[PDB]
Design an enzyme around this catalytic site. Structure first.
Site, short mmCIF file in Angstrom:
data_model
loop_
_atom_site.label_atom_id
_atom_site.label_comp_id
_atom_site.label_asym_id
_atom_site.label_seq_id
_atom_site.Cartn_x
_atom_site.Cartn_y
_atom_site.Cartn_z
N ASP A 66 2.57 58.88 26.44
CA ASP A 66 3.46 58.03 27.23
C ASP A 66 4.84 57.98 26.57
O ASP A 66 5.03 57.25 25.60
CB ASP A 66 2.88 56.62 27.39
CG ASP A 66 3.72 55.73 28.29
OD1 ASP A 66 4.61 56.23 29.02
OD2 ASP A 66 3.50 54.51 28.29
N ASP A 90 9.88 59.97 31.61
CA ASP A 90 8.68 59.14 31.42
C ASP A 90 7.43 59.93 31.76
O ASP A 90 7.05 60.01 32.93
CB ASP A 90 8.76 57.89 32.30
CG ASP A 90 7.62 56.91 32.02
OD1 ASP A 90 6.87 57.16 31.04
OD2 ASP A 90 7.47 55.94 32.79
C1 HRV Z 1 2.71 51.29 29.81
C2 HRV Z 1 2.77 52.16 31.05
C3 HRV Z 1 1.40 52.76 31.41
C4 HRV Z 1 1.39 53.99 32.05
C5 HRV Z 1 0.19 54.59 32.42
N1 HRV Z 1 0.29 55.82 33.05
C6 HRV Z 1 -0.74 56.45 33.69
O1 HRV Z 1 -1.91 56.10 33.77
C7 HRV Z 1 -0.33 57.74 34.25
N2 HRV Z 1 0.51 58.45 33.45
C8 HRV Z 1 0.90 59.66 33.92
C9 HRV Z 1 0.49 60.19 35.14
CL1 HRV Z 1 1.03 61.74 35.66
C10 HRV Z 1 -0.37 59.45 35.93
C11 HRV Z 1 -0.79 58.19 35.48
CL2 HRV Z 1 -1.84 57.31 36.51
C12 HRV Z 1 -1.04 53.98 32.15
C13 HRV Z 1 -1.04 52.74 31.52
C14 HRV Z 1 0.17 52.14 31.16
F1 HRV Z 1 0.13 50.95 30.56
N3 HRV Z 1 3.71 53.28 30.74
C15 HRV Z 1 4.66 53.76 31.56
N4 HRV Z 1 5.47 54.76 31.28
C16 HRV Z 1 4.83 53.15 32.90
O2 HRV Z 1 3.73 52.32 33.26
C17 HRV Z 1 3.42 51.38 32.23
C18 HRV Z 1 2.52 50.33 32.86
F2 HRV Z 1 2.02 49.49 31.95
F3 HRV Z 1 3.25 49.61 33.75
F4 HRV Z 1 1.48 50.88 33.51
#
Ligand code: HRV
Length: 378
Positions: free
Chosen positions: A37, A224
């Protein structure tokens, strides 16, 4: 650049879910899959049972675990987790061949954080300390890795994506020449918190969106890996959707398709890629008055959604309230170099990106662009 043969192909994911890398924590090493991330800055791992975790970090079994005796509570817009801070030894088996002591948020409670079937058990936040929780004194993992080893202060990501699990490469400490073709073009990291950049022009099939470029970066633009969509500020999103509708007008889709709420399907193998436009973002260059342009295809912004005779897709350009987010829809066209040492982000055409016989993702420059500093939101 060179050959980083052990780190090639070290990323995996379920299509529609995030990319993860295998890591180990503790002594003896406990293996976990960790979400990569670049949009956050904490290293946090499941450390108590959960219906969606099939393994977790067991601190009592690690002789090198050290308890910081402090809690951390992290709510997101959607989801939250709470944890106990400590440190331990950490490695990346398909990685730079070094072991470092890092801060670890041991997650003991959570809600809507772990995702059922995603196959990752923690998150590796690769952005800067300014956005670490509970404050910026909690050194992020990559900062610790660089300080404790001779690993160069740089990593690069090739996210390959689908057309079947997805894969890719995270090169820690370097740039692997086999993962891209053509030139690497660099945009400045505007500020070291998120990986913030400045977009100076937007085209749909070469037609200028023709907005004040400040709108493209209101209130920020970031790169991101932890977000699927290309997310655009409201005014920019509305303009882009109008133009993409017009360019693809040979076929008509229900309004819910454009909102990401409904799939569109074609007979297997007959997706009409050529009727959809390419999308170009121009990024500030490293040279005064120069920009360069990255260009993605419908193969990036139409996401395949599988179900056991039709190929069906979701539209993955969506509206943001917090500025532009260049997520996997952007990154899957490119090899992306997070050059922290020189405060810049490099883009090159990815050797694994999904395309067809007649169109490819592209990275081209330079372009004369004046007053690029005015595109940044103060
Ligand atoms: C902290 C946070 C975050 C991101 C994810 N990402 C994913 O699961 C995901 N990653 C890439 C792809 Cl292609 C598809 C998916 Cl589904 C999961 C947990 C998480 F905690 N990080 C970010 N950059 C933005 O969202 C944040 C939020 F907390 F709001 F979700």
């Amino acid at each position: 650049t060179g050959s980083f043969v052990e780190m090639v192909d070290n990323l995996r994911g379920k299509s529609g879910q995030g990319y993860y890398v295998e890591m180990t924590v503790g002594s003896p090493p406990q293996t976990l899959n960790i979400l990569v991330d670049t949009g956050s800055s904490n290293f946090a791992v499941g450390a108590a049972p959960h219906p969606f975790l099939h393994r977790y970090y067991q601190r009592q079994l690690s002789s090198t675990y050290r308890d910081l005796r402090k809690g951390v509570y992290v709510p997101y817009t959607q989801g939250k987790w709470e944890g106990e801070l400590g440190t331990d030894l950490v490695s990346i088996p398909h990685g730079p061949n070094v072991t470092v002591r890092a801060n670890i948020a041991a997650i003991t409670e959570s809600d809507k954080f772990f995702i059922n079937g995603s196959n990752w058990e923690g998150i590796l936040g690769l952005a800067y300390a300014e956005i670490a929780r509970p404050d910026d004194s909690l050194e992020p993992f990559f900062d610790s890795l660089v300080k404790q080893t001779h690993v160069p202060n740089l990593f690069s990501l090739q996210l390959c994506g689908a057309g079947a699990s997805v894969g890719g490469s995270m090169i820690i400490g370097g740039i692997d020449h086999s993962l891209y073709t053509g030139s690497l073009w660099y945009t400045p990291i505007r500020r070291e918190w998120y990986y913030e950049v400045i977009i100076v022009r937007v085209e749909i099939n070469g037609q200028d969106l023709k907005m004040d470029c400040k709108e493209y970066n209101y209130d920020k633009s970031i790169v991101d890996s932890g977000t699927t969509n290309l997310r655009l500020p409201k005014k920019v999103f509305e303009a882009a959707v109008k133009s993409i509708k017009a360019a693809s007008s040979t076929e008509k889709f229900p309004d819910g398709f454009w909102l990401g709420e409904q799939l569109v399907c074609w007979q297997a193998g007959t997706t009409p890629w050529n009727i959809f436009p390419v999308i170009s973002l121009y990024l500030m260059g490293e040279v005064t008055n120069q920009s360069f342009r990255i260009t993605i295809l419908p193969q990036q912004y139409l996401r395949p959604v599988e179900d056991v005779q039709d190929d069906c897709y979701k539209f993955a350009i969506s509206q943001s309230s917090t500025g532009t987010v260049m997520g996997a829809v952007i990154m899957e066209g490119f090899y992306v170099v997070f050059d922290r040492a020189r405060k810049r982000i490099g883009f090159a055409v990815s050797a694994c990106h999904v395309h067809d016989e007649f169109r490819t993702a592209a990275v081209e420059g330079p372009f004369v662009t004046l007053d690029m500093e005015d595109c940044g939101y103060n």
